[PDB]
Ligand binder design. Structure first.
Ligand SMILES: Nc1ncnc2c1ncn2[C@@H]1O[C@H](COP(=O)(O)OP(=O)(O)OP(O)(O)=S)[C@@H](O)[C@H]1O
Ligand SMILES: Nc1ncnc2c1ncn2[C@@H]1O[C@H](COP(=O)(O)OP(=O)(O)OP(O)(O)=S)[C@@H](O)[C@H]1O
Ligand SMILES: Nc1ncnc2c1ncn2[C@@H]1O[C@H](COP(=O)(O)OP(=O)(O)OP(O)(O)=S)[C@@H](O)[C@H]1O
Ligand SMILES: Nc1ncnc2c1ncn2[C@@H]1O[C@H](COP(=O)(O)OP(=O)(O)O)[C@@H](O)[C@H]1O
Ligand SMILES: [Mg+2]
Ligand SMILES: [Mg+2]
Ligand SMILES: [Mg+2]
Lengths: 327, 340, 338, 255, 319
DNA sequence: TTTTTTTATGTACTCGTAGTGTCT
DNA sequence: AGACACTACGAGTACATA
């Protein structure tokens, strides 16, 4: 049953009308398929944007419910070498369908992990067998693909999910589940997503689990922040104010009590302070240079461990010394 | 059978003796275990990614969850645990993990379904995912994406940055918080009472203060203090000084001597005192941490001096975190902070 | 000799009485014993104290040990040959005898010893600082999965390269270097047992003042200078210094005397000759910097820059593999500073 | 609970050897009427459809429809563990998992118990293809396998042409060319060596050499193989067994 | 939907050497060679999508006439091209007897010659030397340096260059005239700008824009095909003030879904191929970009790291 | 003017014992 | 019943890596 799959897998789009966020590419692909001219596609974009769902729904719309048989789907989980290409992909492209009549579809998902020799062998397979089969390459990084292979396909960039589409999907989930969500809670949820539907679905399931109730109540900002462990804008701005204006010992005490009262992480506070200070209209760019350099150094040091108190004091001192040049 | 297990636990160090067996034994990581308890009644366990400081209870939490889910019978048949002591290249991830994921779930017995929920999926956990190469990690993407109906993936790591972005997006991120005195004093007091650890008033809270968010190190220090107090047999209570002596903490007077040598003194005297101090074995990380605490906490230095001392201590800790020579780094730090 | 007069039990130790009492406390109940990590200066006597603690946990047969060989196969057909020190109660492994293949030996050997098993078999990991981060990560879970059959006693000189999980997974025991007085008392018993002739006792103190807490170096230097004075130490017996220390001192003299590229070439040659004779580059850098700071011709401004450059290039060497590539850079930076 | 008992244990071996090379994973559907199996090649060029009725099973008991997903490189190893004069027993519990094979000797007393872990194959395989073909021929399996193995050495593509009482197998490569032409005759002295051909319209289409070589591996099952060809339709290579059949739906190469 | 139509790159693929709008010199050279005969061993190198494979295909077709099927041996990177293939099949084709006109020769076309192993390339030397009177070799590669010098010594070297604006514009105008498409000057200009001398990519983008919107206008081309990635990165690095570069990185690159690895790689490539600034400042910028890439590869890839990289680049440019 | 620098998977070659269909 | 050509899958050995 579908009630056992996680929310990321349960709510996977099955038709092209359930893929939100991407409109300029979805309409163009629908027109390509209706008019017949479907070229070799290259879906490039960040994780969680809906490239795999888009191509799966496309193959479903093209071949019907028997998609799992008329399409050759290869990914990084499967062995994709040059010999694998030579045998499997060439035998698939050269032959025809065993279930119906029509062009074939080869979905090379996550093809950014393929060997250079494999791409060099495939770039002539795409150019030779082009009247009976098509190629779809999904990628997160366009630098791992050879320029020859990159030039044979039409590139579609999957933009991050905007506010309207992600709110539409959230409303769809809140309709499918016996769940209510606060408006400010929804805004905070959209803020900690960066256009990643996977994160939204995961944390929505997690905060529904956090409710502890038969779901007769609502999900507020407190639930989201306590479940995702993300700092609140209130505590963020309080720490920033105490760092910018208050005394050194008082700033240290404030940072300690804020990061220990809710169990917040220093890296999340660093990213939040970076995001907040990005809107600050500042004087001569030397302060911004020092701030960015020191904050990136502290983040790279945190990414390897160390003393949290020493790193917090380093953040405080870096912000203070950077702002001391603004006078 | 069970009695042999009880005796082996009783003859085991306190770290493994008091390992959380149920989801209720987790004292401080409540946000994660609440979701884990709620999904225990349902059947929609998502792919999870535990990350946080070492000794926060990630492995213990996932072990307790798998136990409460499957029972001691299906505990050994529906679990695939891969640690850092095994090979986890592309070949292993493609063959073994994918063959276990593609396989069907084992049939539960009649006694299993009567006491445990027995979900229709199995669990593949990968402990210490920081050592996994990014290509072997990307190989797991579709493996965990397509076979999610029959298996669930649980990644465990300390640095969440070492895991690629797609894998971090596919799994639900569970951040384990540091176990300071506040949220771990109850567990430490329980461990002390269960072992009849007669201590003073401010010992346990001090132990965690030395632990810096690490319950395993705190339990080890408590066990060492209890052994040292039982060997003496005086019947007195453990003192905070006796605890900080065996914890590697530099005494207060020796640190005040370092502060005096830094404040007043030239390069030669500081170098000589550092050479003398390095004879007595002290961890440079602890000395740097104590100096940082003293300098930032003392309300007798200028803010301009405080920015510089904080940046210098940060640089010294970042250099020490790479396996450098403790003597050279400590001498350089003290010399740089003496010029201030 | 160092080996002829060495303690074999906890009651035979003659310095750090508090450490001996802590070891006796830790060995009172031996079955509920967690993993241990002995850290401190090199030459203090931690490897003797670990064996003395094993002598308290087990019978006196712990010292009757044997050397065997075990072969391993990596991802290729290159055969890894590793010798093992084994005892009927414990075993000792030194992963510092190979390159990046520490993880394989660690995981395979420890899993074999843990699957075969007072009731547990002790494991002594010698020079844990050379353990690569991947080998330490592999040992991280092996330390916890098998805690009723395998207990680790890791001997190291500095916990700086040891990862935080391993640090947390074992008790930490510091071994401070013995005072000059205890070293002098030990040398006194040694010279009365080896029948040496001392005109004045204070020379022994000077030996301590030349060893910097090292007992292994102290006894060896005492015996080396006892052979030059023909078993009769006088009031002004010269101090026997190792050859590499003299080479480093001459290198510092050359550094402070001439600062040029022509001298940089011969400095690189001296560094090559030192590295080719089984001398680590970190110790070379440490001794070079410490003996350069002792140069009275320089001032505080020069010494501060020297120590900063030495810390920077020590980080570089800990992050690199071509050691001379960092040593020559540090030497050039010091030349530019002076 | 699935409980099947074969008359000869080597028939299942010969049947599985047919799919051993051209098919990786299988999903046996067991019902009250018999065992059906449909599988797709890794390159998805051929489709294997095996059907064995309850006539082959010496004993058969199927309480409810059972789905057994398994691997063939392990089932073949389990089957080779048997014996030539033994009997085979397939057992599966109410919930399909860890199918059990039992080899029992009929001359002596011997019990060989083997297990096989099932696998959860999400892709269903229930498709049936029942459409009229343009030509239906029948020829000895050995005679067809000989021509296939002889023409596979010349090139990688073998073209089949069906005309008015003429069957032509052409192979053009780099070292030369070749073409075997046969005529449908009726052999009264031996019926298993005759060649029948019923054609409605001439046919001309090519296959690959590897799949055609893998198909003829099933010639050890029956003494005669049927070939159904049509205009751009999966060619039906059928070996009829005394309790069912094994049919390969092969996909030609576009020109 | 039942079937698709042939793309314009394959449908309008040139079949005669006159239809090629590539490098005029080499095109007339190959045309005169096909007219007179005596085709020598050749190696055609260049960049993807400029008319290398089509050129050799047209040459072989025009030179062999109807004997193209039995006189031309095509081997691509999709086929095995190891030592065994060169030893057996190529040698059997070169030794094969074939009655040809007194001005033609058997042609062995080897596409993607830069991917052949060293053993096969070494064995091909005497293979092409002993049968150089009845068999000729034409290699088509992108990097001539990947082919060993002994092989290059026995053949002519034809280096194809990028296609200027005029040639691609003329070819697109011919395609539009042959297809009756509604277009505009600014749309074709945007197409050629996004093509970057890539004729295949230009025709592909044109066909995609036609099938997606019908009218080839700059707005449609820009909404269906984003601006070239290296140009925005160059404009970001060449910024004079830190805030402008930060806003460019935020809006153009980070808010559009470009990964940090792609951004840092494009920055490295642009700084390597930069010519506006001096050598020392370029080396310092490359050093900083590599220092940033060392953190991006370790999994610390975020917007803060790129912001710090831009800040350090500006500090270097801040004298 | 002169020869080695770890691990890590992809690629290519060869010898190689081995498993089975065919011939005096 | 058997001998040995044909053969295909498995351990060994190197060779690159923008
Ligand atoms: N545009 C979208 N509309 C609705 N749901 C979406 C959308 N994008 C992602 N999702 C959800 O996120 C899940 C994962 O989507 P995927 O297509 O697998 O992500 P992706 O774009 O392929 O990125 P990868 O796989 O990490 S490279 C889907 O099953 C949906 O539940
Ligand atoms: N939240 C907790 N509650 C109770 N005991 C805990 C908790 N966290 C850690 N412990 C104790 O510490 C021991 C180690 O737990 P682990 O789960 O292995 O720690 P960890 O998070 O895995 O650290 P690693 O493995 O270095 S990342 C457990 O057996 C417990 O005795
Ligand atoms: N000079 C040209 N004139 C006309 N069309 C051209 C020209 N060059 C390329 N094309 C088009 O681009 C398509 C592919 O050209 P190719 O020759 O395959 O590219 P290439 O120069 O060989 O680069 P590769 O194959 O990626 S190494 C042809 O089918 C034409 O449609
Ligand atoms: N308590 C002690 N009394 C006398 N000698 C000691 C004592 N501890 C260590 N030693 C001397 O130290 C020597 C061994 O040093 P070792 O332990 O190998 O150095 P490290 O601590 O660097 O491993 C022995 O020869 C022994 O004589
Ligand atoms: Mg995907
Ligand atoms: Mg763990
Ligand atoms: Mg080409």
């Amino acid at each position: 049953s579908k009630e056992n799959l996680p929310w990321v897998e349960k709510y996977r789009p099955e038709t092209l009308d359930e893929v939100y966020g991407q409109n300029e590419v979805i309409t163009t692909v629908r027109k390509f398929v209706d008019e017949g001219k479907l070229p070799h596609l290259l879906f490039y974009g960040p994780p969680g944007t809906g490239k795999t769902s888009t191509i799966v729904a496309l193959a479903r719309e093209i071949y019907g419910k028997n998609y799992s048989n008329m399409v050759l789907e290869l990914n990084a989980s499967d062995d994709r070498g040059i010999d694998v290409v030579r045998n499997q992909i060439k035998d698939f492209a050269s032959t025809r369908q065993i279930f119906s009549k029509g062009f074939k579809l080869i979905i090379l998902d996550e093809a950014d992990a393929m060997t250079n020799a494999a791409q060099n062998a495939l770039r002539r397979v795409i150019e030779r067998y082009t009247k009976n089969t098509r190629f779809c390459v999904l990628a997160n990084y366009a630098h791992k693909l050879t320029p020859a292979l990159l030039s044979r396909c039409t590139r579609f960039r999957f933009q991050p999910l905007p506010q309207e589409a992600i709110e539409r999907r959230i409303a769809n989930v809140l309709v499918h589940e016996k769940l209510k969500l606060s408006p400010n809670a929804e805004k905070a949820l959209i803020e900690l997503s960066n256009g990643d539907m996977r994160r939204v679905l995961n944390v929505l399931q997690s905060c529904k689990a956090t409710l502890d109730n038969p779901d007769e109540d609502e999900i507020s900002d407190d639930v989201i922040y306590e479940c995702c462990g993300a700092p609140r804008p209130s505590d963020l701005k309080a720490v920033l104010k105490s760092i910018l204006e208050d005394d050194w010992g008082t700033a240290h005490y404030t940072l300690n009590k804020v990061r220990s009262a809710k169990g917040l992480a220093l890296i999340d506070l660093i990213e939040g302070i970076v995001k907040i200070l990005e809107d600050y209209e500042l004087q001569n760019e030397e302060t911004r240079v020092h701030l960015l350099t020191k904050l990136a150094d502290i983040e790279y040091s945190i990414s390897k461990g160390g003393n949290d108190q020493i790193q917090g004091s380093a953040v405080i001192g870096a912000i203070k010394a950077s702002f001391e040049n603004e006078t | 059978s069970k009695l042999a297990a009880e005796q082996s636990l009783a003859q085991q160090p306190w770290v493994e003796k008091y390992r959380p067996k149920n989801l209720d034994e987790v004292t401080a990581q409540d946000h994660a275990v609440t979701v884990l308890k709620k999904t225990l009644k349902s059947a929609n366990l998502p792919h999870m990614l535990f990350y946080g400081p070492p000794g926060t209870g990630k492995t213990s939490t996932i072990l307790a969850l798998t136990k409460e889910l499957y029972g001691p019978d299906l505990m050994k048949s529906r679990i695939l645990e891969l640690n850092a002591s095994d090979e986890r290249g592309i070949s292993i991830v493609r063959e073994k993990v994918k063959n276990f994921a593609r396989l069907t779930v084992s049939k539960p017995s009649k006694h299993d379904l009567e006491n445990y929920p027995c979900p229709p999926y199995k669990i593949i956990i990968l402990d210490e995912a920081d050592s996994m190469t990014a290509d072997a990690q990307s190989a797991l993407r579709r493996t965990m994406e397509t076979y999610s109906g029959v298996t669930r993936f649980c990644l465990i790591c300390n640095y969440v940055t070492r895991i690629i972005d797609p894998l971090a997006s596919r799994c639900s991120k569970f951040r384990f918080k540091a176990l300071d005195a506040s949220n771990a004093i109850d567990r430490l007091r329980f461990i002390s009472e269960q072992e009849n650890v007669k201590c003073d008033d401010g010992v346990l809270e001090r132990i965690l203060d030395i632990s810096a968010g690490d319950l395993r190190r705190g339990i080890t220090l408590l066990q060492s203090a209890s052994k040292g107090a039982q060997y003496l047999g005086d019947g007195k209570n453990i003192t905070s000084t006796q605890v900080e002596e065996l914890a590697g903490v530099v005494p207060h007077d020796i640190l005040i001597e370092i502060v005096e040598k830094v404040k007043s003194g030239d390069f030669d005297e500081i170098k000589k005192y550092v050479n003398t101090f390095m004879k007595s074995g002290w961890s440079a990380a602890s000395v740097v941490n104590q100096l940082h605490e003293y300098y930032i906490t003392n309300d007798n230095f200028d803010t301009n001096f405080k920015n510089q001392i904080s940046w210098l201590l940060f640089t010294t800790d970042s250099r020490l975190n790479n396996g450098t020579n403790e003597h050279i780094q400590l001498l350089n730090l003290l010399v740089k902070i003496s010029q201030l | 000799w160092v080996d002829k007069y060495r303690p074999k039990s906890l009651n035979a130790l003659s310095h750090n009485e508090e450490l001996t009492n802590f070891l006796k406390s830790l060995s009172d109940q031996p079955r509920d014993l967690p993993h241990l990590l002995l850290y401190g200066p090199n030459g203090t006597g931690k490897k003797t104290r670990c064996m003395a603690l094993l002598e308290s946990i087990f019978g006196p047969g712990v010292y009757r040990l044997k050397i065997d060989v075990r072969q391993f196969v990596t991802a290729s057909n290159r055969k890894l040959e590793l010798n093992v020190v084994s005892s009927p109660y414990h075993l000792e492994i030194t992963p510092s005898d190979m390159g990046n293949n520490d993880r394989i030996v660690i995981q395979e050997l420890l899993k074999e010893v843990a699957q075969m098993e007072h009731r547990y078999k002790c494991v002594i990991i010698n020079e844990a600082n050379s353990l690569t981060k991947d080998a330490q990560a592999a040992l991280r879970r092996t330390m916890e999965k098998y805690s009723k059959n395998i207990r680790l006693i890791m001997v190291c000189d500095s916990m700086s390269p040891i990862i935080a999980p391993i640090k947390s997974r074992c008790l930490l025991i510091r071994c401070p270097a013995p005072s000059d007085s205890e070293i002098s008392t030990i040398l006194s018993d040694v010279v009365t047992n080896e029948r040496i002739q001392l005109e004045t006792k204070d020379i022994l103190k000077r030996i301590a003042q030349a060893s910097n807490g090292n007992l292994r170096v102290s006894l060896l230097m005492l015996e080396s200078m006892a052979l030059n004075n023909e078993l009769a130490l006088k009031s002004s017996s010269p101090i026997i210094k190792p050859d590499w220390i003299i080479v480093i001192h001459k290198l510092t003299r050359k550094i402070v005397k001439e600062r040029s590229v022509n001298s940089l070439i011969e400095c690189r040659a001296v560094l090559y000759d030192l590295l080719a004779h089984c001398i680590p580059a970190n110790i070379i850098l440490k001794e070079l910097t410490f003996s350069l700071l002792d140069v009275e011709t320089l001032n505080t401004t020069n010494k501060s820059s020297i120590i900063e450059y030495s810390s920077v290039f020590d980080e570089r060497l800990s992050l690199g593999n071509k050691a001379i590539f960092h040593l020559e850079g540090f030497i050039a930076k010091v030349m530019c500073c002076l | 609970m699935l409980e099947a008992k074969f008359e000869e244990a080597s028939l299942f071996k010969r049947i599985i050897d047919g799919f051993k090379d051209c098919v990786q994973l299988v999903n046996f559907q067991c019902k009250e009427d018999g065992i059906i199996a449909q599988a797709v090649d890794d390159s998805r060029v051929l489709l294997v459809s095996l059907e064995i009725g309850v006539e082959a099973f010496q004993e058969y008991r199927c309480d409810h429809p059972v789905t057994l997903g398994m691997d063939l490189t392990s089932l073949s190893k389990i089957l080779r563990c048997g014996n030539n004069t033994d009997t085979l027993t397939l057992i599966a519990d109410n919930t399909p998992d860890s199918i059990i094979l039992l080899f029992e000797d009929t001359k002596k007393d011997r019990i060989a118990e083997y297990s096989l872990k099932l696998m959860d194959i999400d892709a269903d395989f229930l498709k049936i293809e029942e459409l009229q073909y343009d030509s239906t021929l029948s020829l000895p399996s050995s005679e067809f396998s000989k021509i296939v193995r002889d023409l596979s050495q010349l090139s990688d593509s073998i073209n089949i042409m069906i005309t008015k009482e003429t069957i032509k197998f052409v192979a053009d490569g780099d070292i030369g060319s070749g073409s075997v032409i046969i005529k449908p005759f009726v052999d009264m002295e031996h019926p298993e060596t005759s060649i029948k051909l019923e054609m409605d319209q001439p046919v001309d289409l090519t296959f690959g050499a590897k799949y055609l070589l893998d198909i003829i591996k099933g010639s050890s099952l029956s003494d005669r193989v049927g070939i159904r060809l049509s205009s751009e339709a999966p060619a039906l290579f059928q070996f009829d067994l005394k309790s069912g059949f094994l049919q390969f739906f092969l996909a030609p190469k576009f020109n | 939907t039942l079937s698709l139509q042939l793309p314009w790159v394959e449908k309008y693929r040139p079949q005669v050497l006159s239809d090629i709008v590539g490098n005029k010199e080499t095109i007339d050279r190959l045309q005169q060679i096909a007219k007179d005969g005596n085709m020598p061993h050749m190696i055609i190198s260049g960049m993807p999508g400029i008319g290398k494979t089509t050129s050799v295909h047209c040459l072989a077709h025009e030179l062999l006439g109807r004997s193209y099927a039995d006189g031309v041996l095509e081997l691509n990177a999709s086929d095995d091209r190891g030592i065994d293939v060169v030893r057996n099949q190529i040698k059997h084709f070169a030794q094969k007897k074939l009655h040809l006109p007194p001005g033609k020769h058997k042609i062995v076309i080897l596409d993607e010659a830069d991917s052949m192993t060293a053993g096969a390339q070494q064995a091909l030397r005497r293979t092409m030397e002993l049968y150089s009177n009845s068999t000729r070799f034409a290699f088509a590669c992108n990097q001539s340096n990947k082919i060993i010098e002994p092989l290059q010594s026995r053949c002519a070297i034809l280096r194809y260059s990028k296609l200027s604006d005029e040639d691609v514009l003329k070819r697109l105008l011919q395609i539009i005239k042959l297809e009756d498409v509604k277009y505009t000057n600014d749309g074709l200009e945007a197409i050629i700008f996004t093509a970057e001398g890539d004729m295949r990519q230009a025709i592909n983008n044109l066909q995609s824009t036609v099938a997606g919107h019908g009218l080839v206008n700059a707005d449609n081309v820009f909404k269906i095909v984003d601006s070239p990635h290296p140009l925005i990165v160059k404009k970001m690095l060449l910024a004079s003030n830190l805030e402008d570069s930060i806003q460019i990185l935020r809006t153009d690159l980070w808010k559009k879904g470009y990964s940090s690895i792609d951004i840092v790689t494009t920055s490295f490539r642009v700084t390597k191929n930069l010519a506006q600034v001096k050598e020392s400042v370029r080396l310092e910028m490359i050093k900083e970009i590599g220092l940033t890439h060392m953190r991006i590869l370790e999994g610390v890839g975020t917007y803060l790291q790129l912001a710090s990289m831009l800040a350090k680049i500006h500090k270097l440019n801040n004298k």
